[PDB]
Copies of this chain bind each other. A is one copy, B any other.
């Protein structure tokens, strides 16, 4: 179960390294209002016991295909007037989702950031904010540096009572080796 805030007040911003910094620490890039889902860690998929018919009983494993689904979407509006905050359904509001699948965007996943689906099924988590980096010189951009507007892709707009799905097939990959050697 997830909760998605609005980030950056619905707008893009360029970000970069802060003033004086080591030449190693300079960066240049952008942050976006969009969020993203990350299931890439194992503990999302396997429970501690399910992990044990795997590692004790087997010499290797690999993924094959996966599914993804969203559902039971509901949007809430909030009123902060005075010292109290009232929250109420907005029934006609939308939430829009897409999957690039042509690998046209900078690919952030795989850098081992936070924002995973929790290891324990009863926890609730925010969706992390999306952003990226591009070629720089110091804290300044270079002519080759690229800027991507996520609004510029086809997406799917969802209200309460609309769901989203897609499925995916892993390319052939070698088994991971869960054995240890008995000979040096």
Give the B-binding residues of A (Cβ under 8 A).
10-12, 33, 47, 53, 56-57, 72, 74, 79, 81, 84, 86, 89-94, 106, 120-122, 132-135, 144-146, 149, 151-152, 157, 160, 180-184
3 smallest CB-CB distances across A and B, nearest first, come from A121-B151, A74-B92, A146-B182
**What chain B residues lie within 8 Å of A146 (beta carbons)?**
182
**A89 and B86 contact, CB distance less than 8 A:** no
Q: How far is the CA of A182 from the CA of B180 in the complex (A)?
A: 33
User: A92: which B residues are within 8 A, CB to CB?
Assistant: 72, 74, 89, 91, 160
Closest partner residue, chain B, to A157 (CB atom): B72
Cβ A144 vs Cβ B182 within 8 A: yes
CB neighbours (8 Å) of A91 from chain B are 89, 91-92
Copy total for this chain? 4
Chain B residue with minimal CB distance to A92? B74
- Determine if A184 and B135 form an interchain contact, defined as CB atoms under 8 angstroms apart: yes
Asked whether A149 and B133 contact (CB < 8 A) given A81-B84, A92-B160, the answer is no
Residues of B near A94 (CB, < 8 A) are 72
In the assembled complex, which residues on chain B have CB atoms less than 8 Å from the CB atom of A152? 47, 121
Q: How far is the CB of A126 from chain B (nearest CB, A)?
A: 16
Chain B nearest CB from A24 CB (Å) reads: 12
